[PDB]
Amino acid sequence: SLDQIDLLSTKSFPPCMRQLHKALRENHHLRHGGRMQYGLFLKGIGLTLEQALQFWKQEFSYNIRHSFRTDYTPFSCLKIILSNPPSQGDYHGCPFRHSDPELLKQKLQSYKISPGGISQILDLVKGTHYQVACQKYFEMIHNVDDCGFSLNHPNQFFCESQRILNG
């Protein structure tokens, strides 16, 4: 079930995907924009997001499984940041770009980022350096001084996080 990756989402998902996992868990649904952003990200980690149905019910809960018709290429940071701004009721997008800075601050606080770390991230967001802000977030949650890569894809954030957590 979807809840098997709650811990993983907090430890290794970038903020854009962490928020989608939380929303799906809390709302029991995501609109298409969110299903696409999060579903493709999961596909990039080797997981298929799907809704379980009952075959014996006539037409006329979300699950994850190892993957066993469509373009499964996961969205990059620039695709997320520059296109499809979320409307109310959407949970997709990049929080560094799309969240009100006051809300972003509160979100980072809930993520247990230090006040000093939050100040650095917000400074970067104000300069429109969204991916660099995200690198700073990465550095904070993994307790490393320098992430040592140039971030431009959510699946790269995940991949680099896994290297540290499984270090």
Site string for ligand SF4, 63-82 (x = CB under 6 A): --------------x--xx-
How far apart CA 99 and CA 143 sit, in angstroms, is: 24
How far apart CA 93 and CA 16 sit, in angstroms, is: 6
Site string for a second copy, 71-110 (x = CB under 8 A): -xxx-x----------------------------------
Please report how many Cα atoms fall inside a 13 Å half-sphere around the Cα of residue 167, on the Cβ side: 9
Q: Is 129 exposed, middle or buried (0-12, 13-18, 19+ CB in 10 A)?
A: middle
CB under 6 A: which stretch of 8-16, 84-92, 107-115, 139-147 binds ligand SF4?
A: 8-16
CB under 6 A: which stretch of 11-19, 24-32, 55-63, 114-122 binds ligand SF4?
A: 11-19
- With tokens 């075959």, the residue in question is 55
Q: Residue 39: CB partners within 8 Å, gap ≥ 6?
A: 49
149 lies in the binding site for a second copy (CB under 8 A): yes
- Shortest distance, position 123 Cβ to ligand SF4, whole Å: 15
Please, what's the largest Cα pairwise distance for the chain?
58
Of 3 and 78, nearer to ligand SF4 (C-beta) is 78
* 8 A C-beta contact, residue 156 and residue 13: no
Give the residue ranges of the annotated binding site for [4Fe-4S] cluster.
16, 77, 94, 134
Q: Which residues bind a second copy (CB under 8 A)?
A: 1, 3-5, 7-8, 28, 32, 35-36, 38-40, 43-56, 58-63, 65-70, 72-74, 76, 148-150, 152-153, 155-156, 158-160, 162-163, 166-167
